[PDB]
Structure 1
Amino acid sequence: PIVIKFSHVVAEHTPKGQGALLFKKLVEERLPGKVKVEVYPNSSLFGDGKEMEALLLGDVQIIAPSLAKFEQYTKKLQIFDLPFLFDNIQAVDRFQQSPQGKELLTSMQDKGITGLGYWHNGMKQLSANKPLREPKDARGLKFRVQASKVLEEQFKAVRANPRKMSFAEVYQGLQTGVVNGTENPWSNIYSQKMHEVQKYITESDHGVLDYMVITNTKFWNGLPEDVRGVLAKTMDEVTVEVNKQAEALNQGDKQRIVEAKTSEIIELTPEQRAEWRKAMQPVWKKFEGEIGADLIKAAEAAN
C-alpha cells in the first residue's frame, strides 16, 4: 500500500493527536489495503525544527506544525502569532475561512508545500511559578516560546526574557529553571505535565495556538487521482471533527489540572486583561511590513 506517515510533537489525547488517529482510522476503512497511515506522536519520529526537513525529503508525508513555526518559509503566517489579534476561536475560524485565509494555505507553494487545512487547538494561557496578574509581574522572568520572532517580541514587550525551545524540551526547561514560565493551551499544559512545574496559570487567552496541516506537493499531486480525492475529502471530515471538539478537550484538561492539585488558576478581570493588551499590542507595528498592513486589517475585520 501507499504509506502515509503522519508525524507530530504532541501527546495522543490532544486535538492534533486525536485528529491524526482519526485520519488513520477513516483512511484505512475507506481505502482498504491501498493506503496505510502510520502516526508518530510525541516527536517519536521527528521533533521540532526537524519535521520540515523530513517532509521535503519525503521521510514523512503529513505534518501539522503550529502556525507560529513557519517564519523561515513564509512571512505571512506570523499574523496568527500577533497577541490579542483574535478575541476568540470564532474570529480565528472566520479569518481562516475567508478568501485571504484560504490563500495562506498556498503561502508555501514555492517551497513545495501544500496546505490541506487549519486545525484548532485553543487560546494560550500564561504560566509561571509566580502569579501573573499584571504585565509588571512578568518582568525579569524567562519564558519559553515557540520558534517565532513575534512571540519573542511579545515577551520583550513586558521585559521578560524569551527563549526559543522545541516543544519536547519545555517540561525539562521549566523543571531545571532554564525557563521559568511559558504559554500554552490547557491541553499542552496537562498532557506534558507542565502544571507539575508551574504553580500559577493565568487564564489570559492572549494568543492562538492553531495548526496548518501540510503535505509535500510532489508526493500529494503524484498520488493516483482517485486516491487523492478520497484522502482530501477524508482530511476535510477530520478537520471538522478536530475543530468542533478542540475547545471541549481544552476545557477537560483545565479541569484535570484543577483535579491534579498542583497549581492555582488565576482569572483576570476584563480590566487586567486590557492591561496586557495595551503592553503587547505595540508588537504588531514591528511586523506589519513583513505580514502586510492590509492583511492585518482583514484579520481585525474577522472580529
Structure 2
Amino acid sequence: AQPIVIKFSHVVAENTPKGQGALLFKKLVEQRLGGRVEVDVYPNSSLFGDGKEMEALLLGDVQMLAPSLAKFEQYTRKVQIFDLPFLFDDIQAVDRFQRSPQGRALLTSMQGKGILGLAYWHNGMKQLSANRPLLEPEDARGLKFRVQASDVLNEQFRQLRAISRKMSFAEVYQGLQTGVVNGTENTWSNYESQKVNEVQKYFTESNHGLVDYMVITNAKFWNGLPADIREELQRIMDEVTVQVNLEAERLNRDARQRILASGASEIHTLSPQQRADWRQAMQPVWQKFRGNVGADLLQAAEASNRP
C-alpha cells in the first residue's frame, strides 16, 4: 500500500540527455513496479538548483539527483579528475575510464558522507562561447567566463588569464545577457536547450573538457528499500543508462545543427595545430590538482585514451 517516493531533481531542460533519462526512469519504474514506487521528476531546478540540491539530498528532502561530475569537490576531491582540460579525448575515453576499477570505485567515493553513486550518464564534450571570436588562447585573456561551481574550472580560466565566475546553471542565460559574464563553456545540448546561443555570438568547437553525470541517492533511503525493489530499481537504472548514452550523442549533434541553422551564432572549428595550442595553454592547470586526484587516477584516465 505505502508507495515509495523517489523525488528526482535536476537543473536541465527536459529535451536533453539527463532530462530524457529522468523521464524514462520514471516511466519504466512506474510501469514495471505497478505503482509501488512513484518517481516525481523536477527539471529546470524547479525543486532544487545547483548546490542546494546536495544539501537537500543529505537531509532527505530529495532522493535522486544526477549532478555534473564538476560539482562534487565538497564531498570528495577525487572526482575533480573529470574536470581537467584535455584529459579525455572524447566520450569513448571517459567511458573506458568510468568502467575501470578506479572509475567504478568513484561511485562509492562519497559513501562516508551518506551519498551513493548508482550510475554514470554521459552528456558530451564542452565547447567555448563568447561575444568575440575565440580562435587562439590569447583571445580569452581578460574575458569573464561563467563556470560551474568547481575549483578546477575556476583555475582553468585563470590559467588563460581570464576571469572566472562560479554561477548556478539557472543563472547563465541572464548572466550573459546582462554582461555579468562574457562567455562560458558547455555542451551543445545545454547551450541550445537553454537558448544561450541567443546571447553568444561565437562558439569554438574546442572539445576541451566534458560534461558527464553521476546519478546519486541518499544511502539511508536506498539501503532502507526492500532488497528485491532496490535490485530491480538498479537493473532499471542500468537500462536507462544505456538509453541516455544514446540520447546524448544525437541530442548534442541536433543541438549543434540548430545553433548553426540560426545563422546568428558562428561556430569556429579548430585544426589539430589550433587545438594543440589551446591544450598547451590549459594543461598546466593539472599541476594544481594532481596531488588531490593522485598519480594513479591520472595515469588511469590518460590511459583511457588508448583503446
TM-score in terms of structure 1 length: 0.99
Once the two structures are superposed, residues 126-159 of structure 1 have per-residue CA deviations (whole angstroms, 9 ceiling, x without a partner) of 0000000000000100000001111011101111
Q: Does 1:142 align with 2:124?
A: no
**SS of the counterpart of 1:207?**
strand
- Aligned counterparts, 1:138-287, within 5 A: 138-287=140-289
Shift of 1:176: 0.5
What is the CA–CA distance in structure 2 between the aligned matches of 1:67 and 1:34, rounded to whole Å? 31
Q: Does 1:120 align with 2:122?
A: yes
Q: Pick from 58, 67, 80: which aligns with 1:56?
A: 58
1:297 is matched with which residue?
Answer: 299
- Aligned counterparts, 1:8-157, within 5 A: 8-157=10-159
What is the CA–CA distance in structure 2 between the aligned matches of 1:47 and 1:8, rounded to whole Å? 7
**SS of the counterpart of 2:208?**
coil
In angstroms, what is the RMSD of aligned CA positions? Answer: 0.6
Q: Any gaps of 5 or more consecutive residues in structure 2?
A: none
Once the two structures are superposed, residues 53-100 of structure 1 have per-residue CA deviations (whole angstroms, 9 ceiling, x without a partner) of 111111111000000000011000000000000001110000000111
Shift of 1:244: 2.1
> How many pairs are equivalent?
303
Once the two structures are superposed, residues 167-225 of structure 1 have per-residue CA deviations (whole angstroms, 9 ceiling, x without a partner) of 00000000010001000000000011110000001000000100000000000010011
**SS of the counterpart of 1:65?**
coil
What is the CA–CA distance in structure 1 between the aligned matches of 2:121 and 2:228, rounded to whole Å? 24
Q: Which runs of 4+ in 1 moved over 3 A?
A: none
TM-score in terms of structure 2 length: 0.98
Once the two structures are superposed, residues 281-302 of structure 1 have per-residue CA deviations (whole angstroms, 9 ceiling, x without a partner) of 0111110111102210111111
Structure 1: which amino acid aligns with 2:188? Answer: W
What is the CA–CA distance in structure 1 between the aligned matches of 2:191 and 2:27, rounded to whole Å? 27
Structure 2: which amino acid aligns with 1:218? Answer: K
What is the CA–CA distance in structure 1 between the aligned matches of 2:106 and 2:259, rounded to whole Å? 35
What is the CA–CA distance in structure 1 between the aligned matches of 2:11 and 2:302, rounded to whole Å? 30
What percent identity do the matched residue pairs reach? 77
**SS of the counterpart of 1:285?**
helix
Shift of 1:259: 1.8
